[PDB]
Ligand binder design. Structure first.
Ligand SMILES: Nc1ccn([C@H]2C[C@H](O)[C@@H](COP(=O)(O)OP(=O)(O)OP(=O)(O)O)O2)c(=O)n1
Ligand SMILES: [Ca+2]
Lengths: 350, 929, 349
DNA sequence: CGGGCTCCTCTAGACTCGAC
DNA sequence: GTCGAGTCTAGAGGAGCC
């Protein structure tokens, strides 16, 4: 229960212990995450987007409405697959009817538990039937590597081949939570049945190009839970330290001062620099209720803050600022001019 | 009656085949010899054993030209290699004008007439050449320039990538990117390399150009062993040293100093073609081409001094024909090769980062022991460098907000300009300890990765970081005695060592797989995985963290040591025009696919036993479910319409040693106990000697091969015990010694083999008992006395196997040419022969290979005078007919990089292994169409 | 009407032409957005986040659910204010009982029309009554500056002062669409009434340090529409060319095209540009080719800053044709200086 | 007394070369 | 003008093959 209390103290999970029952967190009946939790979820979404949509020439974003009107009134969505399949004909025009191509979307879906809300990342991968199993294996490996490369213990991310009630091939991704393995991502090799049902009539519209051959694509659907993924990463990260990934740490750097007026302007300039660079900074030069250095170090360790920048009296003399990392617990004296390049390189090369 | 038996009741060759091969007129062994053989067999308790007859085979073999088998082989080899001997003699009678002073700066080939005039020609258009090729290593594998020596005129070649400066050239090589050459003969020092840059050598259909190698003939005439090479190099800087003055290493400078002995060879100090860019080559064109011409001239002189000696010491034409046929290796590939490279590299990187995550976490958690000087209480990390270095020192309104931002930025900029105060060279992590500094790359590195990325299990601090322990004792490294562990005190395993002098501790080395003399260099070897699983070797974190490191090390060990070789393999992708119509019209042909080939850079005679040597393809691991990228050979896939038809000889050295011992004892098959044991056994019943050993001792059949071949060539009983304990962990030290005495002191079964081998070895001029090829001049008793005894005794059998390979190659080429079999030689491992045949002629190729094996066995028998051949070894057990290249036709090649197998990831199905009884039914017993 | 047709064709808006209408776009009942529209809204959200939450130590994200349980039988949320007000107590501990602070959020809000879903960017500012109107005016000026920063004609982003029935000062930002003026944002000074209603009694928990004394802050509402903002920017940016601002345009460079080596060069350039953070349209994958005028028209209607062409001459010298959306001026530059040029151009504006 | 080959990574030594 | 960071070679140990 130490992880939940640390999340409460560092604003990852809101509410008291009553609302922090792990069943509530898994189901989605919990209240919203804290600002640090929101930042961690946003980092996960950004990394997922970079891995799936940005670096693929055939994957495009898609916007699916949160509600599904009609057949007797409308309902709220439970999966992102339906809305993405609703845009297949329209998005065929982007890739000039070439296969494979994908539609991706990160959003919130509602399922009965009380209504539990889950942040889900989906990828509908229209493929010719010839290489559908090959693409399923490739996406299994790719998504498993994506989950593992941000984890301190990649062995806790596993896979399991599974068959649907109709015999459709598929795979399931799990994380080894302390209580048990909970499903976090599911790949199904759905055929053309969903497309044919959603588009009754002529199959000429759905004809994609497999090389020089027209064919109806096989819907490889990938759905991943980002709230449960964030909780899994919080468990994986957890001297009490949340060793979140440098590309997933909610707060990259916390700047503190150890000449009240001059150091304030120095820290303000460094704050503006790192921010414009693209690095979110926790202001540690504003806390009137100052504490000892060890207490600040413990607080920053519990907050998954990668670096603590210290501006002292000697900084004005020679420009050297102390810099402590979350990993070795050792700080290093580096010049102000070189701080932005070092931080950017540390974040990018991670 | 086709069934025949010898005086020892061993089923001999069928009557028809015996009459076709040996004809008639053989001499009976005599009553005394039969009595001696029966007495020996009854003494060893083998005369009363029965045997199940094998089905007889009736074949209309191709008409043998000569009066007997030896004359037939001589005629075949002379017909095969007659033009090339003439070209070599043309080289022997060649005089050239001095090299031109002004080399031509033009793309293509240039012919230099008298006085140095440069004439552009399309091709040298000659029958014999001396060839050297220079390649800009920093640019790729495309050839840069080449100089060729013909008896009439010099020739020089310059590439398009050396005369023209371009922003970027294509990285996928093509026949248009190679040197245009081509009955022609090309001579070079490492001609295999120079062969790989010829445009016409990558065509699917074969060519009549053969290549002669200076290193191969040097090894044939006056070669040196690896230990001999080391001793030669040490002496250039065992009581026998007469071999030094007549031998040298394969370096062209040393070879020219040996065979010619003129002025020392001139080597460029800059080495621009290796450690330089294309601009340096363009600036120093004349000097580099002059060096190439000098190397070509030295090679020509060495060839002139070597060829008569090689013909003297290897007078059998089959030797030359097989050395020429062994240098035309050809391995087809496709786009699956590129995909395999990508997948293997990706899997290697994934496993590497998976291991490095745990390693970096352990290292980072160890930096906290610096605080409070707590490292003095850690048994693993009390002797590292924990020292830290000091750093080297020589509601605001819009206007108000803008002014505040500008002032803050200017204050930062003013303090930003203080960079001149600090030294130019950035200090590498002064704050962290020294052991942590050594594990971190510097920021200047373009491939910088955060954290201690420069860490691996092979380093000397990893076991201390992982807190590996042996029987509850922390691991300790001794520079004198390798690894080990510290027992508190002041246990008997591997003995104590007082040299470490650690206060209040004892040092015991880890058990090495090769005895107490050897030292363990890393606890993460494959031999320590059973000890990690058992519990003697444990990690501080415990659980799966420990064993997973060794598992991943085993998985990625091969790719770590072979990715540079495999990825850098010179692949030339043939266009659609160069491909045959059969490949294009086949259903499996892919329009968007690639079809190329890899020419192995094979040194035909790189061994004192005249064996071949290739850095990669003769070291290529077979497919395994644990080693990453172990499907290397499985990626050699035949083009559409083609199949890789080949086979492996069964129990080669065992049969050669047995037949030699029998011929020494009496002119019959199965005279000695060892010969009788070798013959009595089938491979479909699992009763052959290798399978019998694998049954008697629980080790696998490959371990049985290792055990038998060690015991043959002088391995002692302690070696047998160590091998048994290594390959079977259920055996104890006392139990393993029982099985060592059971197969060593109970042998004499193999006395005649030893007698024959020591008779050939101690002879003044040792020769192969089949083709008469002599040993290297640096191994004759007049030069080495009693030294190198094991090498010389093994040389007889190994060179006999090489002669077997030569005979197989000659016979296969003859059968392919005579009956119009569409195919070519693919690659030959030390006892394997792969042939790239079309799908329509796979069974004809199989029958041809069976006939070749029969003829080679009969030749081995006849040259020893046995005048007959047993039916047990007269044919191949099974000839593989597969599209890809693998040890067995049924393995699907599942790998960490190839998890779905060859059938799912690629389109490769499983082939068939067929015996003679099935090949005959498939082709009606005739090689003709 | 032409702009909506271009947006539908160029995947700025999804769905059929008949479904897409002005009223449906302004009410949130439209079928949705295409990939280009999604990326444009994502750029808008990123810029708004950088302008509000970033560059300030007092603004924090809000995590409010889409439904409000409990008796009013839950209902879909209509605004992001309630989540911030519920997080008010914990955020005081987050700022260590300081004052003032903010709680800004971007999310989908549900409004009856049918079900109309709008992406709204709100800003709940908690300030003591001493400096209420000062912070209100500061937020008004900063929001108007942000809206006018990307506008080709910033005179169309109007601002007005309106008084509600309750009698509280407020502002209403607008955009001058061709048919008329539509409300894209609205500011109100609600006060502490909502917080008192949501926390009846025990005002000691709501106290914050306004310097030395303890005060219960008021509530400031700065609620805008990012979908209406996207439509306003599309109309402001409209030879058929969508001159979007570089910080908002979804696709920066279009890359086109010996097929194999040219494809390899284009792939390398594509990888470099993507790794450096520049979105590229992979037009070189298309085997089918049309007139370069058609390509330029397509890339102009897609609000693509530049079109890069790799040809046979590139292998020899490394020069690539570069076409500018704004100036229509073609030039030849080395392929190794394209990334730096694009980064400098983006940073410049 | 196994034989004949292949090559890698790591560590130590020697060396050099520049920076202060 | 001394000294620390590259550079290079070499030797050992491990690991593929037959
Ligand atoms: N450890 C080894 C392995 C092989 N060889 C030699 C002896 C063989 O004659 C030759 C061929 O290798 P194989 O292992 O293929 O030997 P076989 O052909 O006898 O194996 P099998 O017949 O069981 O396929 O290599 C050796 O001396 N020592
Ligand atoms: Ca064999």
């Amino acid at each position: 229960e130490a992880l939940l209390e640390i999340c409460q103290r560092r604003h990852f999970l809101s509410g008291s212990k009553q609302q922090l029952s792990r069943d509530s967190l898994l189901s989605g009946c919990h209240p919203g995450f804290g600002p640090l939790g929101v930042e961690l979820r946003k980092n996960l979404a950004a990394e997922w987007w970079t891995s799936v949509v940005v670096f693929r020439e055939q994957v495009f974003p898609v916007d699916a409405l949160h509600h599904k009107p009609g057949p007797t009134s409308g309902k709220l969505r439970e999966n992102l697959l339906h809305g993405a399949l609703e845009h297949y004909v329209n998005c065929l025009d982007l890739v000039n009817k070439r296969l494979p191509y994908g539609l991706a979307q990160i959003g919130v879906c509602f399922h009965p538990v009380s209504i539990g809300e889950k942040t889900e990342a989906s990828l509908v991968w229209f493929t010719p039937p010839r290489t559908s199993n090959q693409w399923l294996d490739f996406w299994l490996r790719h998504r498993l590597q994506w989950w593992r490369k941000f984890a301190m213990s990649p062995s806790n991310f596993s896979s399991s081949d599974c068959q649907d009630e109709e015999g459709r091939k598929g795979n399931k991704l799990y994380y080894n939570f302390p209580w048990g393995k909970e499903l976090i991502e599911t790949l199904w090799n759905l055929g053309d049945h969903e497309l044919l049902h959603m588009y009754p009539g002529n199959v000429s519209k759905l004809h994609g190009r497999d090389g020089r051959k027209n064919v109806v694509p096989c819907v490889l659907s990938v759905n991943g839970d980002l709230d449960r993924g964030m909780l899994a990463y919080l468990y994986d990260s957890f001297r009490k330290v949340l060793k979140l990934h440098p590309c997933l740490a909610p707060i990259k750097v916390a700047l503190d001062v150890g000449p009240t007026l001059e150091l304030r302007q120095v820290c303000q300039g460094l704050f503006n620099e790192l921010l414009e660079n693209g690095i979110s900074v926790w202001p540690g030069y504003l806390e009137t209720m100052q504490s000892s250095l060890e207490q600040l170090y413990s607080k920053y360790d519990e907050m998954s803050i990668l670096f603590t920048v210290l501006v002292t009296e000697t900084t004005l003399e020679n420009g050297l600022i102390h810099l402590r990392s979350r990993d070795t617990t050792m700080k290093e004296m580096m010049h102000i001019s070189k701080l932005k390049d070092f931080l950017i390189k540390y974040i990018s090369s991670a | 009656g086709q069934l025949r038996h010898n005086p020892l009741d061993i089923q001999m060759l069928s009557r028809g085949l015996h009459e076709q091969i040996f004809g008639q007129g053989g001499e009976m062994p005599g009553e005394a010899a039969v009595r001696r053989s029966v007495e020996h067999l009854q003494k060893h308790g083998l005369w009363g054993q029965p045997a199940v007859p094998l089905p007889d085979v009736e074949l209309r073999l191709p008409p043998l030209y000569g009066d007997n088998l030896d004359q037939h082989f001589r005629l075949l080899a002379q017909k095969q290699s007659l033009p090339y001997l003439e070209a070599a003699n043309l080289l022997l009678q060649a005089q050239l004008p001095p090299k031109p002073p002004a080399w031509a700066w033009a793309e293509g080939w240039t012919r230099y007439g008298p006085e140095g005039e440069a004439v552009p020609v399309a091709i040298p258009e000659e029958r014999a050449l001396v060839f050297d090729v220079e390649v800009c290593l920093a640019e790729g594998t495309c050839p840069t320039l080449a100089v060729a020596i013909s008896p009439s005129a010099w020739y020089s070649w310059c590439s398009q990538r050396l005369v023209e400066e371009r922003y970027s050239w294509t990285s996928q090589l093509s026949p248009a990117d190679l040197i245009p050459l081509e009955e022609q003969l090309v001579v070079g020092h490492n001609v295999s390399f120079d062969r790989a840059h010829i445009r016409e050598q990558y065509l699917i259909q074969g060519s009549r150009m053969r290549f002669l190698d200076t290193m191969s003939m040097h090894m044939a005439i006056s070669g040196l062993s690896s230990f001999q090479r080391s001793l030669w190099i040490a002496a250039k800087q065992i009581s026998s040293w007469d071999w030094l003055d007549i031998s040298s290493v394969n370096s062209l400078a040393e070879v020219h100093r040996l065979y010619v002995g003129g002025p020392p060879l001139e080597k460029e100090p800059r080495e621009l073609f290796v450690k330089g860019t294309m601009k340096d080559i363009r600036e120093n064109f004349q000097d580099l081409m002059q060096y190439c011409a000098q190397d070509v001239w030295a090679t020509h002189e060495v060839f002139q001094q070597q060829l008569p000696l090689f013909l003297e010491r290897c007078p059998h034409p089959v030797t030359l024909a097989g050395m020429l046929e062994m240098g035309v290796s050809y391995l087809p590939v496709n786009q699956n090769w590129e995909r395999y490279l990508a997948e293997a590299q990706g899997t290697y990187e994934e496993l590497q980062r998976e291991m490095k995550k745990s390693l970096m976490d352990l290292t980072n958690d160890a930096c906290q022991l610096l605080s409070g000087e707590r490292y003095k209480e850690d048994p693993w990390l009390w002797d590292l460098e924990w020292d830290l270095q000091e750093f080297k020192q020589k509601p605001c309104s819009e206007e108000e907000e803008f002014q505040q931002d500008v002032m803050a930025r200017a204050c930062l900029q003013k303090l930003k300009g203080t960079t001149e105060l600090l030294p130019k060279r950035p200090q590498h992590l002064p704050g962290h300890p020294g052991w942590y500094r050594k594990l971190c790359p510097r920021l200047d590195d373009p491939a910088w990765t955060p954290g201690p990325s420069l860490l691996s299990l092979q380093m000397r601090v990893t076991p201390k970081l992982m807190a590996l322990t042996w029987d509850g004792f922390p691991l300790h490294y001794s520079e004198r005695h390798g690894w080990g562990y510290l027992v508190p005190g002041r246990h008997h395993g591997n003995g104590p060592y007082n040299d470490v002098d650690i206060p209040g501790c004892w040092f015991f080395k880890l058990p090495h797989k090769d005895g107490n003399s050897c030292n363990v260099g890393s606890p993460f070897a494959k031999d320590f995985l059973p000890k990690m699983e058992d519990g003697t070797l444990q990690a501080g974190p415990g659980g799966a963290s420990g064993p997973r490191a060794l598992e991943i090390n085993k998985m990625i060990s091969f790719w770590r040591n072979a990715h540079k070789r495999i990825s850098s393999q010179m692949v030339v992708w043939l266009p659609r025009s160069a491909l045959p119509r059969a490949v294009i019209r086949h259903p499996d042909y892919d329009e968007e696919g690639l079809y190329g080939a890899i020419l192995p850079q094979v040194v035909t005679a790189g061994t004192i036993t005249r064996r071949a040597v290739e850095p990669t393809w003769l070291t290529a691991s077979n497919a395994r479910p644990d080693r990453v990228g172990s499907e290397l050979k499985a990626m050699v896939q035949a083009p559409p319409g083609y199949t890789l038809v080949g086979a492996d000889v069964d129990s080669q050295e065992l049969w050669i040693a047995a037949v030699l011992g029998d011929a020494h004892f009496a002119g019959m098959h199965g005279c000695t106990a060892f010969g009788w044991m070798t013959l009595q056994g089938r491979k479909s019943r699992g009763t052959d000697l290798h399978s019998k050993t694998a049954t008697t001792v629980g080790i696998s059949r490959e371990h049985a091969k290792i055990f038998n071949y060690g015991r043959i060539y002088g391995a002692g009983q302690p070696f047998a015990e160590r091998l048994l304990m290594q390959f079977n962990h259920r055996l104890t030290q006392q139990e393993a010694a029982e099985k060592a005495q059971q197969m060593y002191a109970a042998t004499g079964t193999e006395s005649e083999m030893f007698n024959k081998l020591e008779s050939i070895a101690t002879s003044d001029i040792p020769r192969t008992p089949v083709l008469g090829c002599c040993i290297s001049r640096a191994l004759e008793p007049s030069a080495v006395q009693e030294e190198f005894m094991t090498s010389r005794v093994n040389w007889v059998v190994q060179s006999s196997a090489v002669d077997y390979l030569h005979l197989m190659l000659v016979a296969m080429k003859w059968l392919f040419e005579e009956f119009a079999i569409d195919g070519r030689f693919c690659i030959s491992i030390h006892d394997e022969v792969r042939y790239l045949v079309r799908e329509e002629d796979r069974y004809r190729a199989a029958l041809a290979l069976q006939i070749t094996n029969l003829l080679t066995r009969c030749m081995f028998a006849y040259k020893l005078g046995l005048n007959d051949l047993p039916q047990s070894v007269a044919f191949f057990s099974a000839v593989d007919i597969d599209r890809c290249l693998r040890k067995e036709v049924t393995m699907d090649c599942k790998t960490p990089s190839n998890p779905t197998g060859m059938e799912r990831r690629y389109g490769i199905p499983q082939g068939e292994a067929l015996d003679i009884y099935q090949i005959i039914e498939l082709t009606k017993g005739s090689l003709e169409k």
